[PDB]
């Protein structure tokens, strides 16, 4: 009969055809069913995966465990949960790539319209150039410099640390004081040792330096004064010409100098070897100056200006008979000279009668004396006898 | 006749075939036209999308708005603009993935040969490990420590800030000076308050400390001296043995000590009671030294070396009739002793005639006296009379 | 016999069919060979690339070099090296996207089960939000602030640098000392100049300030004392009432003041004019006190407390014949007053006979005198004579 396929009219074929030679088409192939090719496949321009109610995907099979094959199969799936009526409906459009175990990564647009690219592990780029914000929850390490156009802010008590060689140096704000601190040697990332180089009180701003301070090029305290425990060495500049040296703006002020070299101290006043004499009548001793002897001593200056300046010279003894004598002088700005050193009068260096214009108590000579009431010589009193217009004698 | 398909030779079919049963092929299928499968599709090893003049793509349809379907369709497109003759021809090879609204991401090889991976939103990895450079234009926040092998550099005036509790501490380089500054309490991320703990002049390096300074373990000024407004309390170390204590390298220098305890000051010189006498002839007063009375006082030392050192002792009055007296001594290194304190002579503590070997102004006694010109007793003048080897007595009215 | 195809029975076609009209299928198409479509292709729900020994891939052809075509073809390949491929066996499953030259990016799960997403160039997101760690090997730049909840640590000698205007300020830990340093003007990223504002010794914590120090609001040295090279100007607060001013807790201590204005110095003691006289008998000179002359001077105070406090007043000459005199007084807390200034006795300002109750050396008057041994008038000794109960004269 005509149970054969017509070659020129539209035919429905109810046999299962097996084409053993190349099949050539020049018109659309339209199937309601599946396709399977045991060889490779190619199409022009576009491949569309149609969706009739279940999300579309591509599957990349792992194949046998040999050659260049993967350990697991992979897929690309385009899906969402906006329409699923679940507890999460915010994953509107998701492009997900992953294997049998879990996703590797996905991009998604959420219901709010914003895009996220999630990586289920470590992102390893060469460079990073982000136009927006960065947040990193874990520890960060940088191999070179880090430059910000803004401020670096730490919320950690130990905030900024510089490590080099054996030591970490760090700034610590402990909420009460901010400290500059140091580690033990070889403990560069660890805690502070016992040193307290510098701290600032967070409330008052007062600074404490705890391990000593050296300053070069001068100090000025503008206000509030100075308290020192427990000595001050103000060390004057010792020059060969101290005896005659005019003060300058650099050398005014308080200082002391140990003048211990004879080339200098021979120019200054000496001490006097003292000679003890004894009053013939009372037996009380008194001192008189013997020879002047040059001596080392301390030169101390006081006063703050080229007008207001004076010095003290205190000899110090370096031999058994040596004694200390003090001398003073004043800078005379208008005369452009030091006053001459004058000796301080003290119990070790008293003034003599001849220094003051007083009669010696012993062996004295004078031009004239007037006695009002009586002169006694040994046991005779000589008194005025105005009646006989003379003097009366009077044994006692 | 030949309006039927042959099973044995090549055959052109000119009617539309509908195959209702499975079709098997064992040789290539070559179409110059489209393919449409209402079911799923599979191929072996490689799928190739061919390009005859327009970029190639895969389209993932969104389907009905139900189940696990996406809200928008997506595509993968491979394209470029190197050959399009536009103002931009630098996007040489682009792999772009996105939806109906915009791309989600793309990778691109630029015309310069370098690769970029652009993400149109937020990237959310677990770890990051970059072998090259990082740039971030916006604010950065880190949850733990940040370690660099290089330098941290800020171009912001407020450059480095440590926040803890109520306060921010920060370093500010304002182009003229660099300051160490503090915020008001509870204003930790804000501006500086009025405090000026420390600043450094950027030109000279000179430091100003603005809120006071405490120092432990010594200060040395190497050069330039010291100016102080407006007093210096150099507080010496007070010990029970100050009267006899040899100086040490630690105690040389200038200081003062208030010796206010009698166990110590009773070892030191006292002040002297003074009696005011009157010269009978002239009526002018003079002070006669009385009893020494022990007293608290100030001990002040000067000198900087174990050779060059001396002290002043200035008593101060604590009772209604007490006076003040000053005393001095000097350290004697070669004797290993202080000289004995000696009294300073001054208008309140004058030298006494017996101290100096001067005759008292009245009621006096002496061994002998020589008069050259005259001695007068009452109205009698006694004068030399050498021609008679005697003296004359002249009443002189 | 029947070299024609049955339209209702399973057939094996052995010549090449060329179909010129639309082919419809309603059952599976199953091929052991390849497919090639010159138009677009579509399938429902899933596309699977089967793997029978070689890794699966999709190839996107580059086409002619015109329009919107890419310069190179691209592929997505899913492969691994766990089962072959040289010396590395750790790349278990790799999803690789790239062109003819190299990969652009890949995701992979390694043998240990961990996922990496590798980008062969620059990643350019808007925001970054990493839940784990960050490492960046190259230089890093931030456009705004950088906040860390932890510590910032630098291993670079030059550790923290703040740049503004012409200068960089930086903290440098050089292993031995930590320095606060400054650049030359206009060399903001460069080395330190010669300035040494501040350094901390890493071992002792001792601080050195190298370019001068100003302090406001007071200084206290708690221990260790003070050494100064080479002067100290302790400048007291000059007020109009210095003569009578009671000390306060703020004004106790050591200082000097130049009292240069007569309104104030006229209240203080002057110097005394002196005339040099000569003792006629001995030829020895002595200074005789004359008028007080008001003078500017230096007031210096010593002592640290409201009990322990005293002052020196040292006049200085401002006219050609002016002398210098020193005066002293002590603060008397219990009397709430300064003692009266008293004159210092020195070689330029000796005591006078009237100060001490001594007889002047000549031209003198007194009430009475007792002579134990002899009175000599001219060359006659007047001595006591017991035998007549008067005096005898003896020529010498």
Numbering used by the authors:
A (entry chain A), C (entry chain C): 893 to 1288
B (entry chain B): 893 to 1289
What did the article's authors report about this structure?
The proximal half-fiber is formed by a parallel homo-trimer of gp34. The protein is a highly intertwined trimer containing a 2 nm-wide triple β-helix domain interspersed with three wider domains in which each of the monomers forms an anti-parallel β-sheet. The long tail fibers recognize the outer membrane protein C (OmpC) or the lipopolysaccharide (LPS) of E. coli and are responsible for the initial and reversible attachment of the virion. The carboxy-terminal parts of gp34 that we crystallized occupy the part of the proximal tail fiber closest to gp35 (the “knee”).
The structure of gp34(894–1289) was determined using the single-wavelength anomalous dispersion method (SAD), using data from crystals of the P21 form grown from protein in which selenomethionine was incorporated. A high-multiplicity dataset measured to 2.0 Å resolution at the peak wavelength of selenium was collected and used for phase determination. Thirteen sites were found, where fifteen sites were expected (five internal methionines per monomer of the trimer). The resulting phases were of high quality and, after solvent flattening with 53.2% solvent, permitted automatic building of 1102 residues, of which 1095 were automatically docked into sequence. Manual fitting and refinement led to a final model consisting of 1189 residues (893–1288 of chain A, 893–1289 of chain B, and 893–1288 of chain C), plus seven glycerol molecules and 1620 water molecules (residue 893 is the final proline of the amino-terminal purification tag). Here, the refined model contained the same protein residues as before, plus seven glycerol molecules and 1312 water molecules. Both the native and selenomethionine-modified models have good correspondence to the measured data and reasonable stereochemical parameters, although residues at the amino- and carboxy-termini have higher temperature factors and show some disorder. Crystals belonging to two different space groups (P21 and R32) were obtained for gp34(894–1289).
